[PDB]
Design a protein around this ligand. Structure first.
Ligand SMILES: [Zn+2]
Lengths: 387, 311, 341, 77, 596
């Protein structure tokens, strides 16, 4: 069992520290198994060996863990990364001076799967943000430059790595504890920088929202940065996609522009509508409509404490659309524009599939009726799409 | 024949299928002879760092086959009168480029274990396993510096040399079988030549070599305390020859060889230790060489001499 | 809202080592006229009509683009909104042609790049002088950043000293011995009396035997712009020493010169480095503006801090406080300058 | 044969004996032996000219009792 | 480490010093003068004005500069300190080395002696100071070989001088720290440190009861110190350059000083203005030793960087101009070899010495060939030129003033030459290939019984002179074992050789194993009108016959001319020399062939 090894490393550490290189070699050898019990045993062997021994053996431990991480096999990578995470949360001060070795992993970012990169950035960030480091905070201000030089790159893969790292570091930097200080302003500056950098490419733009809206949900963050990001995201989404309903007509398209799938048929009493058709026609930005709304909703619900009364007209809003029903223009005119119609139906169905996810927790009866009608609309669209 | 170094940029970012990369690596194999000897290691580095996301068996197989063929040709046409004679690239260049390339391949294998597993499964042996060569033996001996592959390559080498000595003992025992086939270089002389060739200032194979010698000696020692004894005796003789050969050439390792032999021979277990004793007597023939490097292990061996029994 | 009328150079890939060097070099008071006059001779030479003959014109092209863009912003502030910068492209391409080891997008040292471009401009000016003599401003680097070194060595047994003159372009200086260390101690570690002992001996020729020797350094001829170069690293596998030594603003060098001197070497430029490892980093410059509309005169005598594209004025006392080793300045100084005031 | 000085990284002075027929890489190997720095991080600056792996000592007009300051390369960018 | 073999080319007896003299000791009971030579030999001279040839004997065991000597034990024993890092104890009457102390780790620079305790101490550039009871050292035998030490600590830098007083109660050291540091030798406790002097101190003296001290310094001053007051009570600046040597009379009232400026003064300590110019020597004065038979000393002996030693007479003290102009006795010295050039055959050497005499030597036979007189040295080099290349296989050093040849494993066997190009005939009509270093190794160990095989003694082509000293040392410093060539048959010498001769010499001298050959790759192409390789000694003729055959003796030579870099090659010239002298490009040598 493990309390046996606990007693072993607690009582006889002074004699056992003589041959710690052999201990580390044995742990490295037995970590290469397939089951989970042996791997966990070797993991805790590394942990306890780092806990009690001399600083040189600690350097040897972190070197062995680094070469384990850069080895390549998935189970070894996950196990070693988890070991490093629990080791740095256990004894941050001893691990602090050995940050060079763990940072040196960042040169090898082709042997690591995309999911483990987030964990690596997480463990490095929580290493570099303990208040014992505030005496000489060098790792933090080095990583704020590493992220910048990653984002300003031209290779797409490093740009994606940069956005992942920037989001997962800003999350720890603005972490909610038991602040509202200049660190929040730095968090805001980092976020607007990484928004300006990755605003152009849409495939690289969707990842930013799909990481930020996960971080702002599973973890939490302090009310000040929350307030600022909520204000700017609400302003930006209100300015960007929202087109007033009373000015619905606009020309220059081969298809007759119309508004469909509204609720209660108010017929443009006030200005709420989704301008989906012109954006797609110009893209013969709208590709990132699906996650931007999710980020907006989750941010506003966290800012107002589960109160969605602000985004209320964004359930009965209609969508600018052509005559999506097949008017016998399917057998004929089966040109490239047919694929455009397919993508349009796909994207509006995805928007409906997100908007039904948005308002379900609320318990107002007629509002529940609204979301059920939205469900009927998405099922009829999913029927139509096969044509 | 000049832009081939930048010909690799086409396979970096765009995805490909197996047929076209196999065709281009076949072209590369065909032009290995054309380009130059000295330009090879950077090209090997480029192709092998490309190979992680694509073809992995083909490049390693081509490099191994090319260098085995080149070593074979150089060895066959090197023999002759010590005078003016036709020869290709000299030994001092060939051994150096081989050392750089084997070190690069070991590094690349250390970057991803899948290449090493493919290499090990590729050279699997009963069978002749004709792909074995001084270059490939050196490769397998240098991969042992990684903990993942140590036993997995040493057991393969051990079974290979046992199969070779069994083949020799079977072939010498008949006329008909000796009448039909022409002799092939049996792997005993292959390793016995690799150890001699290892003088050319590369030491990353000495540890694998001494470990192989000790494993191969221990596993087939005379345990008498009849047909299978002859391979089991030739194997021990080969192990002693290998150990004594690496003792003289390389300096950094000679302190540990004698320590292991002593630590294995000074026992009260009364196990048969005739071969270890013979090896120790052979390697203390060069008395000053021992005194330069390791004159301490013999001293504490002497201090323990009071406790052992009479024989 | 507030855009500083001082132009930066875009990142343009993984290249900031050249951006910092170029920005800290453009303000060198003698460089701007000379590097244009040399191209002005080149233009008439081409009018009369090479690999080493193109950088010396590319630099002038970059300088005129920089000056023209800065003036264009200056008389028309409405046009430019957020970023006031350009990108060094012809210079980078030419310098790639000059030395192929920068081909790619890796990181690079800054002092080495400065050495390369200075050696190349010296070589091409010397070649132009040779072409002229084959038939006042030809001396640019041989006069600006280069002076003469005087060495001596005293064999303790024979007590006879021999000299050995040398050329120098930068005083490479150690950062710590192996508590704060004044830069005066840092220089006197490099250019003062120390002995050679132990496994290291000086084979004297008057005595025909290995022996203990005492050797020193002397600054005979002083260039127009002296550039201390702090070896802010150490061996042991290697690492960076992020504990900067105290730096003065008015350096006087009467201790180590041979003849008595009355000179005042005042600081006007600093190139820093921001990282914790030898293998990476990000160079930021810092240049005092001192010479060369009245809007510019308001900014005269202040300190700037050039990042790649942005720029922010810092008052001089703030910059001086920013280099004290009382804390970690987060940007280790690496290559100081000193104009001969 | 001749014997030259190399002002080391930290300010000390080391002396090494090389002949004018020696390659620069051989001198860097000598430095590796004397101090322990792998001959990829060296750059021996002499009289403002940086020594390179192609030429030899006699090409640079280096004679007895000269100095070569030793510095590393600090990657940045 | 790595063990080198060396040997010195010289005559069996060097009666006269071949270099300067570092130190002097005068035995008053036997009228014998000891000189410690920079040529590594200590010599004993008679100072009887009777004999015309004062030389008596040489004691040769040291390997490098002898820096200090002290006569101990009422003149029976002298102890010497040398730059080979050892201290040796000699029987001064019979002139042989009895023990070698090896506890120091760098040049030993100074020795000190306390007559009333018969105590000596040694100190050097390694910053260590060891104290030794002489009777414990003399009691040493081959069984009782244990000696135990006592040393002083505190010294921060290399020691250049050292003095003790007669009672052995105060010891002072001088060093580049400029402060002289003082200890009590009886307890090893550190005592006060008197700071004030501003430079190295190469000369130190103490009065009998260790109450006053004189220091001499490279700053040119003499300073008198009271140890009871711990301060300077007078400073004398009588020299222009560094003061290197001090002596004082028994009354401690007149100081004799000398140094780099060659002038020797006698100054009265109580009244400086009364001073006497004793003489101006011909070279910097390094050390002086008074004869003290009578109160106003009759003479002073003077050591310089020159090989001659002058005795100057002292008429008296009571009375710009020198008191004396010619020495009273003169012990003659010999010339030092100061310049050496190895010829292209890598076999003969041209020398120049301090007298501007030029000589020609045979490295292989370890002897001189001819005196060439005072011809111009560089014209003699240019006149003896032969177009041949042979790889370097030894190195020469002149540190002892004689020719010392050193062999190293890295290049000892690099030079194969043909018997014909050497001075070794072909008595069987053919000439095979000899390795020079291997032949030399076999000649040096010719008398070692272990190389004798069943009788051959040597190599069959030449002998070295039997008296040549053969030295086995480690590279950088420590000599391991030194013997004369003829002495190798002894049982003690053979045991120590068996224990000391490295395996790389054993390989050649015992096993009679051939060294590796060297081959040269080269190109052949039709630009005169395939990649091959051959021995570096192959003659062009062999390539010409090769070409003659592959494109089909006397006829071959008549028809085919071989070229390199468009120069016509001498058919007798070998490939190695062509490559060294004619190939001026890079990459492999390229030869062009043609048919005529
Ligand atoms: Zn000298």
């Amino acid at each position: 069992q493990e309390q046996l090894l606990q007693s072993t490393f607690s009582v006889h550490y002074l004699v056992l520290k003589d041959m710690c290189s052999s201990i580390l070699s044995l742990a490295q050898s037995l970590l290469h198994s397939l089951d989970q019990s042996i791997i966990s045993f070797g993991s805790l062997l590394y942990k306890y060996a780092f806990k009690f021994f001399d600083t040189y053996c600690q350097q040897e431990v972190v070197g062995a863990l680094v070469t384990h991480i850069c080895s390549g096999n998935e189970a070894e990578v996950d196990t070693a990364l988890d070991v490093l995470l629990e080791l740095v949360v256990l004894n941050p001060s001893a691990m602090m001076m050995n940050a060079v070795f763990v940072k040196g992993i960042l040169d090898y970012l082709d042997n690591i799967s995309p999911q483990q990169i987030r964990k690596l950035f997480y463990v490095l960030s929580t290493l570099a943000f303990s208040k014992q480091n505030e005496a000489s905070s060098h790792i933090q201000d080095d990583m704020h430059l590493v992220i910048r030089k990653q984002l300003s790159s031209t290779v797409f893969k490093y740009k994606l790595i940069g956005i992942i790292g920037a989001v997962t570091m800003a999350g720890i930097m603005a972490a909610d504890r038991s602040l509202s200080d200049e660190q929040c302003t730095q968090v805001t500056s980092l976020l607007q920088l990484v928004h300006s950098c990755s605003e152009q490419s849409p495939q690289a733009s969707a990842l930013y929202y799909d990481e930020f809206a996960n971080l702002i949900q599973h973890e939490k963050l302090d009310p000040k940065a929350l307030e600022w990001v909520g204000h700017t995201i609400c302003n930006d989404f209100q300015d960007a996609f929202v087109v007033d309903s009373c000015v619905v007509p606009e020309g220059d398209f081969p298809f007759p522009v119309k508004a469909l799938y509204g609720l209660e048929e108010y017929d443009t009493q006030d200005g709420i509508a989704i301008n989906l058709l012109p954006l797609l026609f110009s893209q013969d930005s709208p590709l990132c409509l699906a996650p931007y709304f999710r980020l907006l909703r989750l941010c506003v619900e966290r800012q107002h404490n589960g109160n969605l009364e602000e985004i209320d007209g964004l359930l009965d809003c209609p969508i600018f659309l052509t005559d999506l029903e097949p008017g016998e223009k399917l057998e004929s005119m089966s040109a490239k524009e047919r694929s455009f119609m397919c993508s349009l139906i796909f994207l509006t169905l995805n928007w409906f599939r997100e908007i039904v996810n948005a308002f379900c927790q609320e318990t107002s009866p007629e509002m529940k009726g609204k979301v059920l009608t939205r469900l009927k609309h998405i099922v009829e669209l999913q029927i139509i799409l096969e044509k | 024949q000049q832009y081939v170094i930048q010909l690799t940029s086409m396979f970096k970012d765009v995805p490909l299928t197996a047929e076209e990369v196999e065709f281009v690596v076949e072209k590369a194999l065909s032009m290995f002879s054309k380009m130059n000897l000295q330009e090879i290691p950077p090209l090997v580095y480029q192709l092998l760092v490309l190979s992680s996301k694509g073809s992995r068996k083909s490049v390693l197989e081509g490099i191994i086959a090319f260098f085995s063929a080149l070593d074979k040709q150089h060895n066959e046409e090197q023999s002759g009168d010590e005078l003016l004679d036709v020869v290709t690239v000299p030994s001092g260049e060939l051994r150096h480029v081989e050392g750089t390339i084997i070190l690069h391949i070991v590094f690349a294998i250390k970057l991803d274990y899948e290449l090493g597993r493919e290499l090990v499964k590729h050279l699997k042996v009963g069978d002749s396993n004709n792909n074995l060569s001084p270059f490939s033996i050196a490769l397998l001996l240098s991969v042992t510096r990684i903990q993942r592959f140590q036993d997995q390559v040493l057991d393969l080498l051990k079974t290979s040399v046992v199969k070779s000595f069994k083949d020799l003992q079977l072939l010498q025992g008949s006329k008909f079988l000796q009448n039909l086939v022409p002799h092939r270089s049996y792997v005993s002389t292959m390793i016995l030549e690799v150890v001699k060739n290892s003088v050319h200032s590369w030491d990353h194979v000495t540890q694998g070599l001494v470990e192989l010698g000790f494993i191969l000696m221990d596993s087939y020692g005379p345990k008498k305390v009849s047909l299978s004894r002859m391979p089991n005796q030739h194997a021990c003789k080969l192990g002693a020859n290998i150990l004594l050969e690496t003792f003289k050439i390389h300096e950094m390792i000679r302190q540990e060889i004698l320590e292991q032999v002593l630590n294995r021979v000074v026992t009260r277990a009364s196990s048969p230790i005739s071969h270890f004793l013979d090896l120790l007597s052979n390697i203390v023939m060069y008395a000053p060489l021992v005194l330069q490097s390791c004159s301490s292990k013999v001293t504490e061996a002497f201090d323990y001499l009071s406790f052992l029994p009479l024989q | 809202e507030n855009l500083l009328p001082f132009v930066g150079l875009n990142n343009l890939g993984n290249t900031s080592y050249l951006n910092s060097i170029l920005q800290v070099l453009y303000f060198c008071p003698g460089f701007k006229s000379g590097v244009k006059h040399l191209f002005n001779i080149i233009s008439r030479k081409k009018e009369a009509l090479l690999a080493s003959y193109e950088l010396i014109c590319s630099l002038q092209s970059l300088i005129i683009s920089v000056e023209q863009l800065q003036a264009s912003f200056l008389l028309n502030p409405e046009k430019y909104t957020d970023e006031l910068a350009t990108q060094p492209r012809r210079l980078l391409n030419t310098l790639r042609e000059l030395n192929p080891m920068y081909e790619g997008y890796l990181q690079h040292d800054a002092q080495e790049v400065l050495q390369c471009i200075l050696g190349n401009i010296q070589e091409t000016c010397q070649l132009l002088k040779k072409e002229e003599v084959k038939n006042i401003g030809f001396e640019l680097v041989e006069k600006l950043f280069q002076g003469q070194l005087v060495l001596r060595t005293r064999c303790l047994e024979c007590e006879s000293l021999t000299e050995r003159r040398e050329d120098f372009q930068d005083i490479s200086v150690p950062v710590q011995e192996d508590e704060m260390k004044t830069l005066r101690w840092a220089i006197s570690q490099f250019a003062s009396v120390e002995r050679i002992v132990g496994e290291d001996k000086y084979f004297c020729e008057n005595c025909h035997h290995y022996t203990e020797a005492e050797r020193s350094l002397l600054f005979d001829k002083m260039p127009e712009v002296i550039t201390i170069h702090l070896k802010c690293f150490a061996a042991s596998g290697l690492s960076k020493i992020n504990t900067p030594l105290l730096t003065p603003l008015k350096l006087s060098l009467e201790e180590w010169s041979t003849k008595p001197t009355n000179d005042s070497y005042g600081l006007f430029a600093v190139v820093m480095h921001s990282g914790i490892t030898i293998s990476s980093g990000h160079y930021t410059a810092s240049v005092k503006v001192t010479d060369l509309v009245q809007s510019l005169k308001e900014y005269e005598g202040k300190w700037l801090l050039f990042d790649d594209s942005e720029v922010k004025v810092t008052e001089e006392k703030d910059f001086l406080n920013s280099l004290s080793p009382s804390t970690s300045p987060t940007s280790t100084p690496y290559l100081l300058f000193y104009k001969k005031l | 044969s001749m014997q030259i000085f190399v002002k080391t990284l930290t300010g000390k002075t080391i002396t090494l004996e090389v002949e004018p027929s020696d390659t620069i890489e051989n001198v860097k190997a000598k430095i590796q032996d004397k101090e322990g720095i792998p001959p990829d991080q060296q750059r021996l600056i002499f009289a403002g000219k940086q020594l390179e792996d192609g030429r030899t000592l006699s090409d640079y007009n280096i004679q007895k009792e000269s100095t070569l300051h030793l510095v590393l390369r600090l990657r940045g960018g | 480490r790595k063990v080198q073999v060396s040997y010195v080319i010289r005559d069996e007896v060097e009666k006269y010093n071949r270099n300067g003299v570092n130190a002097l000791q005068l035995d008053p009971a036997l009228n014998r003068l000891f000189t410690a030579g920079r040529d590594s030999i200590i010599r004993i001279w008679s100072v009887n004005q009777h004999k015309q040839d004062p030389y008596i004997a040489s004691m040769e065991h040291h390997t490098d500069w002898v820096n200090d000597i002290v006569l101990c034990c009422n003149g029976k024993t002298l102890i010497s300190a040398s730059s080979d890092t050892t201290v040796k104890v000699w029987n001064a009457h019979k002139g042989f080395c009895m023990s070698t102390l090896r506890t120091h780790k760098d040049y030993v620079k100074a020795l000190a002696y306390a007559k009333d305790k018969e105590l000596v101490a040694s100190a050097g550039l390694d910053r260590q100071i060891f104290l030794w009871d002489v009777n414990t050292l003399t009691a040493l035998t081959a069984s009782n070989n244990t000696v135990t030490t006592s040393s002083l600590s505190g010294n921060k830098d290399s020691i250049y001088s050292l003095a003790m007083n007669q009672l052995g109660t105060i010891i002072v050291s001088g060093s580049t720290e400029k402060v002289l540091r003082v200890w009590d030798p009886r307890t090893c406790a550190k005592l006060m440190k008197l700071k004030g002097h501003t430079d190295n101190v190469k000369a130190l003296l103490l009065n009998r009861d260790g109450t006053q001290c004189l220091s001499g310094s490279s700053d040119g001053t003499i300073r008198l110190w009271s140890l009871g007051q711990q301060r300077c009570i007078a400073t004398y600046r009588v020299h222009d350059e560094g003061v290197w040597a001090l002596q004082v009379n028994d009354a401690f009232t007149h100081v004799y000083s000398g140094g780099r400026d060659r002038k020797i003064y006698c100054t009265d300590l109580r009244n400086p203005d009364i001073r006497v110019l004793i003489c101006e020597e011909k070279a910097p004065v390094l050390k002086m030793e008074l004869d003290r038979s009578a109160d106003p000393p009759p003479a002073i002996w003077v050591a310089t960087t020159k090989s001659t030693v002058n005795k100057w007479t002292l008429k008296g003290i009571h009375n710009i101009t020198p008191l004396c102009t010619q020495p009273d006795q003169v012990i003659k010295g010999g010339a030092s070899i100061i310049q050496c050039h190895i010829l292209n055959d890598k076999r003969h050497i041209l020398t120049k010495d301090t007298n501007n005499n030029v000589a020609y030597w045979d490295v292989l036979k370890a002897c001189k060939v001819e005196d060439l007189g005072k011809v111009d040295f560089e014209d003699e080099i240019k006149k003896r030129f032969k177009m041949v290349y042979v790889p370097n296989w030894f190195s020469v050093d002149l540190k002892t003033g004689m020719l010392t040849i050193t062999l190293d494993e890295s290049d000892c066997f690099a030079a194969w030459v043909s018997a014909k190009d050497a001075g070794f005939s072909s008595p069987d009509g053919s000439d095979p290939k000899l390795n020079l270093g291997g032949l030399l190794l076999q000649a040096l160990l010719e008398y070692w019984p272990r190389t004798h095989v069943n009788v051959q003694k040597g190599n069959g082509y030449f002998q070295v002179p039997p008296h040549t000293p053969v030295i086995f040392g480690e590279a950088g410093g420590r000599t391991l074992f030194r013997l004369l060539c003829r002495d190798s048959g002894g049982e003690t010498e053979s045991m120590l050789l068996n224990e000391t001769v490295p395996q790389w010499v054993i390989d050649i001298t015992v096993d009679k194993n051939m060294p590796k050959f060297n081959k040269i790759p080269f190109y052949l192409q039709p630009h005169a009108s395939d990649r091959l390789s051959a021995s570096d000694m192959l003659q062009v003729r062999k390539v010409m016959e090769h070409v003659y055959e592959k494109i089909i003796a006397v006829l071959a030579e008549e028809k085919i001319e071989l070229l390199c870099q468009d120069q016509v090659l001498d058919p007798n010239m070998d490939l190695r020399t062509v490559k060294h002298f004619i190939w001026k490009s890079g990459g492999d040598l390229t030869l062009h062939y043609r048919q005529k």
